[PDB]
Structure formats: structure tokens, C-alpha cells
Amino acid sequence: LNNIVSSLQRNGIFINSLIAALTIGGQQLFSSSTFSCPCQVGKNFYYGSAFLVIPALILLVAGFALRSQMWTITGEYCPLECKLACLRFFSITGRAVIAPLTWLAVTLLTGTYYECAASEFASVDHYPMFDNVSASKREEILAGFPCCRSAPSDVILVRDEIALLHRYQSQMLGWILITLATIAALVSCCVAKCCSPLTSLQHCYWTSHLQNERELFEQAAEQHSRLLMMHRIKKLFGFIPGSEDVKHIRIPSCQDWKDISVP
Amino acid sequence: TGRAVIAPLTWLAVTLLTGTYYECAASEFASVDHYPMFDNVSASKREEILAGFPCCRSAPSDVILVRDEIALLHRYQSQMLGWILITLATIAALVSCCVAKCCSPLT
Amino acid sequence: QVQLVESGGGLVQAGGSLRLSCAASHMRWYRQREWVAAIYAGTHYADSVKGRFTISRDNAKNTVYLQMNSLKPEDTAVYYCFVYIGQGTQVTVS
């Protein structure tokens, strides 16, 4: 039964779906817990914009870095070898970039981050209520109502309209981004099915072979290290550990401990 | 070192994100000359009340809204620092990994 | 060298009016001690007694003027002033 779970774990679509669901849940928890939408007139666009970008950037970097094989790819970087490196890089990038795309999409769909983000950028010259011959209190109240300040002075309905407008735009952006992303994927796949010299079945078999040989060589290296250490003990103490020791014992002296300290 | 330093980084990040520690920390360092309410010709009661409202003292004398703004400002800064620190940390990790994949002789 | 004196107070019954004047040789008010109002040109009032007082001043006579309307026994206090603390005046309402 657990073998089936591991088999589905090998399915990349399932692991990417798990990543997307986990990122969406984390974003929802973060928004519901620790956002608070600071309401300062001076720099409020900064807070929302940072909430939009920094989590996406750190998730992208984490996805790129958590894959060990990309380090080897870069080391080789720093014919067919170039094509294979490009294919592996594209395949790893896909999973590296799925999560930040999910974060951006869900944030835009929710709309709160964009709502608090570009709120002070709203156009109010159309509305005749906001005269503000001072020209400064207008920006103050504009940044002030979207966060938590109702300020029930007839402006609330206006503010909702403004909010609605921004929210509407947010949704579009999300979907717009989504569209572009999908388009990119398609053309990206085109490259992976146009510049690739290997057959479609050849690529999957080669990847399975690479994973199998990597695991096999790791196991072989561990076993070789184990055998080398076993040999070191059977040459120092004169007996093989884990076997019948009642035959001989070296009884090493003080000078013998220094020899095994070399590695 | 990586595992040695992951935990304190987490503590600093979560503390800054929560903001309470920074809120109570640099509260008396706030700039009040901009606000015309705080004249305080004595110049000492001003610092006293400035340190007094952030902890638990509401002191409902019109200053509460002002104090919230001040709190907000500090809170805002706190968040940035956290994320700023986070950014730097990640950058460090990257270049650190670079060394572990540049100076390393082994494959 | 700056001298402050609270003047214009006294005894008033319910529903009456009282006017306070202070001579000063950026003003605040005190009563007990509790805040009352502030003036510079921005002006604020206490939420406890919001909608009852009115504070004004003029640099011509270097004096500050506070207006209390429909006073009630609930605000029985000694009224002070602050820019240095004024001597203060005691006022009750019956």
C-alpha cells in the first residue's frame, strides 16, 4: 500500500499539486494572521508591493536552490552535453517556479494585497467630493479608508466603489498572469520537444537511468566506505567486528590510536 | 553552521514579523517634533508619556490615535527589517553555497 | 518672567454658562489632574466632555479664553492651565 503512495509521489503532477495546495494554505494563514494593512499615508504602496514580491522571490529562490542537481548543472556550466543540461534545467525550473506563480495568482485573486497596495494611486479627480484645496488631506484619507477606517462621512460608498475598481483590476491581473504563464509553458514545452535530440521515450528512460545510477552509486559508495572501515578495524584490532571475536585480539597500545586518526 | 544558525534566524524573523518586541523596544526613540500636540516645555514628561502609552497605558487624552499612528509606524518598520533580514539571509545562503560549490575539490 | 493667572471662574448652577480667562505674559488646559483642551491653530477636546466646551485665544491681548456651556455638577473640579504650571481655580456646579 505504501508502495502505491511512493509511486504517486514519483508522479510530478501530484507533487506540484501538493506544493500548490500547501502554498495556498500558507498564504491564506499568513493573510488572516499577520497582514494588518498598515494605513500610513506616506509609504503604504511599499508595504503591499513588498508583500506581493518578496514572498514570491524567496519562494522562487528556495525552489531553485532546494534541487541539488542544479548545483552540478552550474558546476558543469562554470554538443549533446549542452542540450542535456538545458533540458534538465528547464525540467527543474518548472517545479522551481510553480510555487511563486501559485503565490502570485492566489494573492491577486484574493485581492487584499493589491487593495492595500495601490490604494493611494487611485484617481479621484473624477469624483467631485474630493476637492481638498489643501491637496494633502486627500491623499491622507485615500490611504486611510482602505485599511480599517470606515470614516462614515458619505465617503464610504465612494471608497467601496474605489475598492471595487481596484479589486476588479486585481482579478484581471491574476488571470492575465495565469494566461501568460500557461502560454509560456506551452512554448517552453515546444522547445523541450523541438530542440531535444532524444526521442520522447528516450528522455524518460534516460532520466530513470540517471536516477537509478545515482542511487546505486550512492549505495555502492556507502558500502565501500563500510568495507574500508571494516578492513581498517580488522587490520588494527586483528578481528572482524560482528563476527566470532573469540579467536584473537590485538590489545593495541597507546601508539596504535594515532594511526587510525589519519582519516 | 547552516543548521547552527537556522534557528536564531527563525527567532529574529518571527519576532520582527510579530513586531511586539520592536514595538516596546524603540518606542521612546520615536520622533514627536513633527506632532504639534507634544510641546512639553518641561521636555521630560514627553519622554515619560512616550514610553508610557505603548505598553498597556491607553491614557484616553486624544493622544491614543497619535500613539496608534506611532505604533503603526514602528510596526511597519519592524516588518521591513524582518523581511530585509530575510532577504539578506537568503542572499548569504546563495553565496555561501557558491563557495561550497566553488572551493570544494570533491565532486 | 511668564506669569499665568486663572480668572473668570466661580459658582454656577445647572444649565448656566461660564467663561474662563487667563493672562499670559500654544496653550493647554488642566482640571482636577485631567486634560481639557489644546490650542496653538489646531484645537482638540476631551471625549468625556465632547460637545460642551470651546477654547479660543488671541495674541493681541496675549490671553486665552475657554467657554463652558450648560455646566452640570458632574464636572466639579479645580481648573488649571499649562503652556510652568498655573495657580489654578476651583469651580463647583450645583
Tab-separated table of C-alpha atoms in Angstrom, chain A residues 30 36 40 43 47 50-51 54 71, chain B residues 17 75-76 79-80 83 87 97 101:
chain	number	residue	atom	x	y	z
A	30	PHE	CA	-0.381	34.495	6.608
A	36	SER	CA	-2.846	44.165	9.322
A	40	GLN	CA	0.182	55.348	6.776
A	43	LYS	CA	4.584	54.741	2.294
A	47	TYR	CA	4.128	47.524	2.192
A	50	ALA	CA	6.720	44.087	-0.798
A	51	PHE	CA	4.093	41.634	0.441
A	54	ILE	CA	9.355	39.326	-1.537
A	71	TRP	CA	24.407	22.815	-8.360
B	17	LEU	CA	7.241	39.887	11.959
B	75	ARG	CA	5.332	48.192	13.424
B	76	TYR	CA	5.752	48.991	9.748
B	79	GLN	CA	8.093	44.243	9.284
B	80	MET	CA	10.559	45.679	6.792
B	83	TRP	CA	11.906	40.855	5.524
B	87	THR	CA	16.423	38.807	2.107
B	97	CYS	CA	26.512	27.684	-1.358
B	101	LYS	CA	30.378	24.526	-4.924
